Every structure is written in C-alpha cells, then in structure tokens.
Amino acid sequence: MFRFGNQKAFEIGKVNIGGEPGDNPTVLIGSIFYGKHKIVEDEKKGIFDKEKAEKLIKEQEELSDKTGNPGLVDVVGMSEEAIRGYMEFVADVTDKPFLVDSAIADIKIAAVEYAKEVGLEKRIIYNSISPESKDKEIEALKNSNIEAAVVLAYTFNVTSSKARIDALEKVLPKLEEAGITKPLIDTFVMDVPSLPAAAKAAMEIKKKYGFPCGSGAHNAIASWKGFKNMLGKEAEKPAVLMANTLQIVLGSDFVLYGPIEDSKLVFPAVFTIDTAYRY
Amino acid sequence: RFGNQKAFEIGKVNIGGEPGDNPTVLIGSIFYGKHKIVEDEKKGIFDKEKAEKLIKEQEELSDKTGNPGLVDVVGMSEEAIRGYMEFVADVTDKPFLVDSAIADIKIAAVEYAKEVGLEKRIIYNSISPESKDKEIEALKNSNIEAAVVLAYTFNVTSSKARIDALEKVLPKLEEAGITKPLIDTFVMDVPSLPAAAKAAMEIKKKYGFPCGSGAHNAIASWKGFKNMLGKEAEKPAVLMANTLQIVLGSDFVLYGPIEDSKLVFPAVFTIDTAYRYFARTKDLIEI
C-alpha cells in the first residue's frame, strides 16, 4: 500500500497535519485578503467586507466538518496595518490555527509582534521561511512562542527535486534558532514544469525527514502564459484544481490551494482522493 | 520512458506511448442513458443541433490543447445506434467508439460500419472476459482493428485480478483480429481507483498496450456523497476520479458525458503539459 513509514503528524492548535496518504486527512489551506481580493476595499489600510469575509471562512469550515479534511485560513497582508486587522478578524471568527502570509519580511515580523501583543502566538503559522529569509525574521520568531512555520523550499532550478531538498536543508538550522518545532514544507510550485519536481521533492522529504509536505499551484496556472487567452477564464478552475491535487494523488499532506472561494472545488476533490487511498 | 510502449494510430489519432510523450486521449459519451438531447432512445430521435454542438465543442478544445477528443456513441437499440453512427460520422472525421451494454447492439454497430466503410474509424467498446462468442465472430468478420478491453472483475480492489481479466481476453483479441486493444482497467467505486491505476501500470510494463479508465460511475454510486455535499460537488469529485490514473501514467480517459469536456480537457492538459517536461526521465517513472 501507498505508505512512506515513520511520518510525522504535527499538532498545531489542535489540528493534525502530516502522516500517510489516505490514513491521515489532507489539510486544505485557503487564502483570504490576497492581492486584488474583491472583498477588500483598501489593501493598504486593510478595509474589507466583514460579512463576506466571515462567510468565506465559515463555508470552508462547513466543508471541513463534512469531509474531515481540516480547513485552515491563509491570511495575506499587503501592509503591516492591514495584516494586524486581518489577524484580529480571523481570530474572532474561528478557533482554528491560521497562517500569516506575506512576501515582505517586515509584514510577517509585524504579524509575529501583533500575535505576541494580543495573544495569538500558538495559533499562528509563519508563511514562510526560506533560504532567503532575513536574520531579523529568525530573531522575531526566536523571541516568540510561535512553534509552526511553512518552509518554502525555494530554488531557481524549478525542475529539480534535489534542489528543493537542498533548500530545506539550508532552512533547517534557521528553524532550530527560531524555535520552530513543527515545520510544514512547501515544496514550491512556481510554474507548470515545477509540478512534478515539487511532488517528487515531497516524496523524498517525507522519506528522509517525515515532515508534512505540500504546495500550491494557483500560481502555476496564473503564470501560464497564453493559457487563459486560449482556453478562457472558466477553464482556469479545473486546471487550478488539477494542479492543486496532483501532489495529493502523489502522497502529500496539505494544499495551499489559493483563493478561499475555491473551497467548494478543492474539498470534494481531495476528499475523493483521501477516501480512495484510505479504503 | 523505457521503449516498450505501443502507440496505436486509429483513424490518424495516436493513443498511448511512453508516459509523458504524447497527449492523453479524452473520450466523451453522447446519447447515453437519459441524455436530455435524446427525445426517443429506441428510435434514436435527438436534437441534431445540440448534438453537433457538443461534438464540435469537444473538438475545439482538442484543437487547442492537442488532446485528441473522441466521441463514445451509446446505443440503446440497434436502429438508434446505426443512426447515431451515421450522424457522428457525418459531423467529424475522427475515429469514434461504439458503446452498448447489449451485445446485439454492438454487433449491429459493427455490421453498419462494414456496410458504409467505417471499420478503420470504429473502436468497439468493449470486449470483456464475459463477451459473447457472437461478438468475437462479428469482429473477426470485419476489418475493425481497435477495441476497448474492459478488465472486468468482481474483485474490485485487486490489480492482479484486472491483469488476469485482460489475459482471459487476449485470445479473444487474436480470434477477432483486434490488433489495437485499449485497456480499460475498470474503475468501479472510489476505493478501486488505485487498483485500476496499478493494474494499468503493470499492463504497460508487461504488454505495451495503451491503458485508461473512467470513473463517472464511481461518484454516482458513492452512497451518501450527494446527501452530504452538494450535487454540484460531484463535478470536482468526478474530475479527480477521471484524472488520478493520468497522474499515475495512463493514456486515455472515458470521462463520461461529453458535456464535461470543458472540465476534463483543461485539467488533463495541465497534467500532460507538466509531464511533457519530464518525458523520458527517470524522475517521472519514480514520481
């Protein structure tokens, strides 16, 4: 049977992530307040439709309760002041752990500091730490009780799975320094050709370390030059769903699946794969 | 890639080959049971405009993605399937499948093909360990070369049982003169999805044959699924059941109703495109 052996299931805010195909439910992570999210009126100030945001979060949680696939929120911030208000809102709407997500180190550090101030540290998953992470990111985490982080196995060599393992091994001493004991490895999907390499890296990292592994490909379809021009906008939905679930067919542990609106697509799909492997 | 896979050419459409080399062939059913464009299934009366549109919409997707899009012509009577074949053959030059649960209806499709010269464009769907001798005789007395082989078995979680079913069919193929078999490794329910995929892997290794399946029935029959999640939720579930075997290296999908071409084609195009970058790599074989 499709089992790796000796896999780690980390418990983060009472949610289990990691394990074996079929046996341990895939964790699905939907992003909210992402770039150009239409529920956001002003991304700098972080002004948004709270009714619509709450509904999006609760709709993912309803699907999660039905399938048994844990559903978490990935909170994106484009400014320090925005992400503070987003964190306060999400923490008011749900008890689940959630990710704080920014490409900008200063915004993630501001999220860490806000978690310390209002009392969210052990509910926060830092998204992400990479080989390129700044020392001040590692210091901010070290001076916190945040235990969990996404490790981005970033590499220019997008078709190499070994380059992603190398990237992970560059981050591993940063995790020790920061006190991160529950890493979730984002095996890094940049484009369509990265899809098989990221999946292979997940299998090799699960074999070597047993960490929970996953990725997200909304990205890879959004970056696919000529795709939408040819096939149309609606065609991105099945393409994104496929790119998001290929790694689950190939044994990974979680999906950063992109816009939280897509929960109604990704939960039934992944529920099907998990069920197939379980039985 | 190893170099042992058979890529069959049927009606100038290529099906199969080394994993990642060539586009997945996508096969959508038309005039299936309770298809709403059919007014009378016994007489084969149907909305010709809507049927033509369904076929042409799949072919536009095929022309854009490079995935060959074929029609699976379902018949519920002998007279209906003759008229369906004549319509489909008039609307496209592509090969197409003739499909019925009833042996006599598939035999009538064979006889019609012989009558109007369609034998090189027809794929008989399907031959199984349970096929009647009259089916094998009809094929033997024809120039039809291609058939879907259904690796049918009561043991739905067993991949060895599907290989056994294929090997029961091999001498029927020789007697019928089927030189281009396409192996439907038989998805029954959701738990059979990995067994069918593993069977396809073993068959590709042992024989060179193109392999595939479809899963449309696996979701329809999931007790409690539609009750828990919506009716809409069947579509992403069906997409997965249709694509898991492509992720695991198969060659074609019998994806169900031709209406779903706009769901299956973008998804499979994405897998094929990703795997093309890894064609003939040790990496893809490991993955």
Side-chain angles (χ1 to χ4, degrees), chain A residues 56-68:
Chain A
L56 288 173
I57 296 167
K58 289 206 154 283
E59 285 169 334
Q60 169 175 252
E61 288 190 337
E62 297 170 358
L63 285 161
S64 178
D65 298 345
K66 279 174 190 217
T67 62

Side-chain angles (χ1 to χ4, degrees), chain A residues 66 196 200 230 238 245 271, chain B residues 64 222 228 240 263 286-287:
Chain A
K66 279 174 190 217
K200 180 172 190 277
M230 182 172 78
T245 53
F271 179 56
Chain B
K64 289 173 177 179
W222 189 347
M228 197 174 57
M240 286 298 110
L263 302 177
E286 287 172 339
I287 282 166

Side-chain angles (χ1 to χ4, degrees), chain B residues 223-279 281:
Chain B
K223 291 188 182 60
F225 180 93
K226 198 207 307 213
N227 286 344
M228 197 174 57
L229 307 169
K231 173 76 192 170
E232 307 88 292
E234 288 190 347
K235 302 198 190 133
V238 163
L239 187 53
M240 286 298 110
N242 273 331
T243 55
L244 179 144
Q245 207 166 301
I246 299 309
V247 177
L248 304 180
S250 284
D251 302 292
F252 72 86
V253 186
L254 291 155
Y255 61 84
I258 189 169
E259 281 84 1
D260 286 346
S261 60
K262 71 184 186 181
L263 302 177
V264 70
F265 268 78
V268 167
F269 178 54
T270 296
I271 303 164
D272 291 1
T273 298
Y275 286 184
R276 184 65 199 161
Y277 287 95
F278 285 73
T281 66

Side-chain angles (χ1 to χ4, degrees), chain B residues 153-257:
Chain B
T153 172
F154 281 70
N155 195 355
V156 290
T157 50
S158 175
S159 59
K160 170 189 180 279
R162 297 165 160 77
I163 300 160
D164 284 353
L166 165 64
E167 286 164 351
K168 287 182 177 179
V169 172
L170 294 183
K172 297 173 190 311
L173 302 183
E174 166 166 19
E175 172 75 7
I178 298 301
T179 53
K180 300 170 179 183
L182 311 178
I183 321 307
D184 180 344
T185 59
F186 177 53
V187 165
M188 158 102 78
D189 61 356
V190 166
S192 71
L193 283 160
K198 190 206 181 163
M201 185 200 71
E202 294 304 337
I203 290 155
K204 287 189 63 79
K205 292 189 187 163
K206 178 163 184 186
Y207 301 103
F209 302 146
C211 289
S213 63
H216 185 88
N217 247 336
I219 308 302
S221 298
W222 189 347
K223 291 188 182 60
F225 180 93
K226 198 207 307 213
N227 286 344
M228 197 174 57
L229 307 169
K231 173 76 192 170
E232 307 88 292
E234 288 190 347
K235 302 198 190 133
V238 163
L239 187 53
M240 286 298 110
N242 273 331
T243 55
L244 179 144
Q245 207 166 301
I246 299 309
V247 177
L248 304 180
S250 284
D251 302 292
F252 72 86
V253 186
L254 291 155
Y255 61 84

Side-chain angles (χ1 to χ4, degrees), chain A residues 51-259:
Chain A
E51 178 166 2
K52 291 184 176 180
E54 176 173 359
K55 190 158 181 253
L56 288 173
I57 296 167
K58 289 206 154 283
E59 285 169 334
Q60 169 175 252
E61 288 190 337
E62 297 170 358
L63 285 161
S64 178
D65 298 345
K66 279 174 190 217
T67 62
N69 290 101
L72 307 178
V73 175
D74 177 71
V75 179
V76 183
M78 321 284 315
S79 79
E80 293 193 22
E81 50 166 335
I83 209 170
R84 283 192 235 270
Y86 295 157
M87 297 169 70
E88 170 184 11
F89 175 77
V90 173
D92 279 346
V93 169
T94 186
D95 48 349
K96 299 291 159 164
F98 55 90
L99 288 66
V100 292
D101 179 353
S102 180
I104 307 302
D106 291 331
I107 296 171
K108 288 176 295 196
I109 292 169
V112 169
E113 288 177 7
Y114 179 73
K116 292 174 56 182
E117 295 175 1
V118 304
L120 292 174
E121 290 163 271
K122 292 191 182 169
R123 294 191 46 192
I124 289 331
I125 305 170
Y126 192 96
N127 182 23
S128 57
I129 300 168
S130 82
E132 289 80 29
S133 286
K134 305 175 180 303
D135 289 352
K136 62 175 166 177
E137 293 181 80
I138 300 318
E139 187 65 20
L141 286 168
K142 171 177 196 189
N143 296 312
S144 89
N145 290 137
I146 295 172
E147 287 181 317
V150 178
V151 176
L152 184 69
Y154 180 81
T155 176
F156 73 100
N157 188 350
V158 295
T159 57
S160 175
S161 64
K162 299 277 200 287
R164 291 165 166 77
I165 302 177
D166 294 350
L168 168 60
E169 283 166 357
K170 280 172 182 183
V171 174
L172 284 182
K174 303 185 191 292
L175 303 187
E176 205 181 302
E177 178 71 7
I180 303 287
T181 57
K182 301 169 187 179
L184 312 180
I185 319 308
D186 181 341
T187 59
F188 177 55
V189 165
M190 203 193 72
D191 56 3
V192 171
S194 63
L195 283 164
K200 180 172 190 277
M203 314 168 99
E204 310 187 338
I205 288 160
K206 287 181 78 49
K207 284 190 163 142
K208 178 163 185 182
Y209 294 108
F211 300 142
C213 296
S215 64
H218 31 289
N219 303 118
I221 306 302
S223 74
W224 194 344
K225 187 173 177 197
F227 181 90
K228 183 161 66 165
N229 313 78
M230 182 172 78
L231 287 178
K233 182 46 164 192
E234 289 299 305
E236 291 183 341
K237 282 326 217 233
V240 166
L241 183 58
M242 199 65 263
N244 274 332
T245 53
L246 185 141
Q247 66 189 312
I248 304 308
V249 171
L250 295 179
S252 285
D253 300 296
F254 69 88
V255 189
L256 291 147
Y257 61 85

Side-chain angles (χ1 to χ4, degrees), chain B residues 31-40 42-48 50-51 76 80 84:
Chain B
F31 313 129
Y32 46 86
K34 295 182 190 263
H35 198 184
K36 284 186 173 139
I37 71 167
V38 175
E39 165 183 352
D40 180 336
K42 169 87 190 133
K43 293 189 204 90
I45 296 180
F46 66 97
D47 187 319
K48 289 169 176 180
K50 293 180 166 176
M76 321 286 330
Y84 295 159

